[PDB]
């Protein structure tokens, strides 16, 4: 269920593969190789059967062969296989700063992913 | 720089390998050991900025499973008292109507001790 | 545009008054309107926002104690007001519970709420 | 106990008064960002905290507008007061700036502040 192509609410494209031992691997993009970055993470490979969703998280560092923004985003959330399968997340984006600007280093937000 | 053993505020031990390709792999040890994986900026600036990174632990191994995952977002700061400063989000699997309460937030500081 | 009754995705009802000197005061209550479910809110907002189409920054707090009950916690909402025909307040919130020192690492929840006029 | 002058790790000064009704009122002077002079602070606290050694839940907001400057943003602090020899308030915060819609995704910063009654 988690394996596939997912889209967030602003239209970015996340191609994710879920491995048997809890690994998440894939890529995050915009439609150019210049805008493609590697993602990696983990998920709960044996969730509960009570109806709960499946907890997961992943990271993207915003460095590829073409560009480097000196930043990384982590998404923390859960997959729900409902009428529409979705992944609901909260994220944190941290930019490299000097320690004097460290208090403003980190943004927070939320993203919903769908296969549509 | 990043590769090695790191200790957080509450005596947990993280052993991390920083790959040349930007990969972070390792373990988090608090039966208590779990895989971590993540990414870091493998070509950071040299203007005194720290190096941006993130990683994820899903809290399942061969013995236990808390149906949760934690992601840490932060940066490595090199030097005399090297540290990794982070913020984290812990998400637990909930049902639909408990989802408002699925996510904790906090912060952690890692040192080489 | 902020003064009025706002409803979040949970159905809860927030009655907010925005005063001329950036004060926000009001109540949070259940759909059902009973006294037991009513709590005080206080916060602040940008009383002279940009004219560029930007929204209006604001925040407020609710401690979940009233004369009837006490959950020993507080929620803060940080967000901005977007006006128009589909005025909304977009927020992220932190909820903190009183905890012993041992449990402080798990004292604070985070999430997001969107408020509408309808 | 909560009433007093508090300082965070960055030297900012917060002068808070806890009312018997659960109200928090006061002033903030920040050492960082787009600011100068004092700004109004308002919030709420649990005026009847548990008795089991748990902290006192609280929160407040500052909108960063005064007669001198306006940064079009507001910060909320959420946390708890821990009484004692060295009393302290441990918080997490959210800072939201007014943006347009297309920029809304990068509108909110998140952090943590620790306050003491003794200035660093």
Curated annotation (Swiss-Prot), chain B:
GO MF terms listed in the record are: biotin binding
Q: Is the keyword Mitochondrion in the record?
A: no
Binding-site residues for biotin, renumbered to this chain:
28, 34, 72, 88, 100
Quote the subcellular location field of this record.
Answer: Secreted
Q: Does the keyword NADP apply?
A: no
Q: Which domain of life is it from?
A: Bacteria
Keyword annotations:
Biotin, Secreted, Signal
Q: Which cysteines are joined by disulfide bonds?
A: none
Q: What does this protein do?
A: The biological function of streptavidin is not known. Forms a strong non-covalent specific complex with biotin (one molecule of biotin per subunit of streptavidin).
Assembly mode:
Homotetramer.
Q: What is this protein called?
A: Streptavidin
- Species whose genome carries this gene: Streptomyces avidinii
Q: What is the lineage of its organism?
A: Bacteria, Bacillati, Actinomycetota, Actinomycetes, Kitasatosporales
UniProtKB/Swiss-Prot annotation, chain D:
Role summary: The biological function of streptavidin is not known. Forms a strong non-covalent specific complex with biotin (one molecule of biotin per subunit of streptavidin).
Indicate where this protein resides in the cell.
Secreted
Q: Which residues form the Avidin-like domain?
A: 1-120
The UniProt entry's sequence similarity note says:
Belongs to the avidin/streptavidin family.
Cellular component per GO?
Answer: extracellular region
Q: What is this protein called?
A: Streptavidin
On assembly, the entry states:
Homotetramer.
Q: Note whether Secreted occurs among the keywords.
A: yes
**Which superkingdom heads the taxonomic lineage of this protein's source?**
Bacteria
From which source organism is this entry? Streptomyces avidinii
Q: Where does biotin bind?
A: 28, 39, 77, 93, 105
Keywords for this protein: Biotin, Secreted, Signal
A GO molecular function held by the record? biotin binding
- Motif segment (Cell attachment site): 44-46
């Amino acid at each position: 269920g988690i394996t596939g192509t997912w889209y967030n609410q602003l239209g970015s494209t996340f191609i994710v593969t879920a491995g048997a031992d809890g690994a998440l691997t894939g890529t995050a993009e915009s439609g150019n190789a210049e805008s493609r970055y590697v993602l990696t993470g983990r998920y709960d490979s044996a969730p509960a059967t009570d109806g709960s969703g499946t907890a997961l998280g992943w990271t993207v560092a915003w460095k590829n062969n073409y560009r480097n923004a000196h930043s990384a985003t982590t998404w923390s959330g859960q997959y729900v296989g409902g009428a529409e399968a979705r992944i609901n997340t909260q994220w944190l984006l941290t930019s490299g700063t000097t320690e004097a600007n460290a208090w403003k280093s980190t943004l927070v937000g939320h993203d919903t992913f769908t296969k549509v």
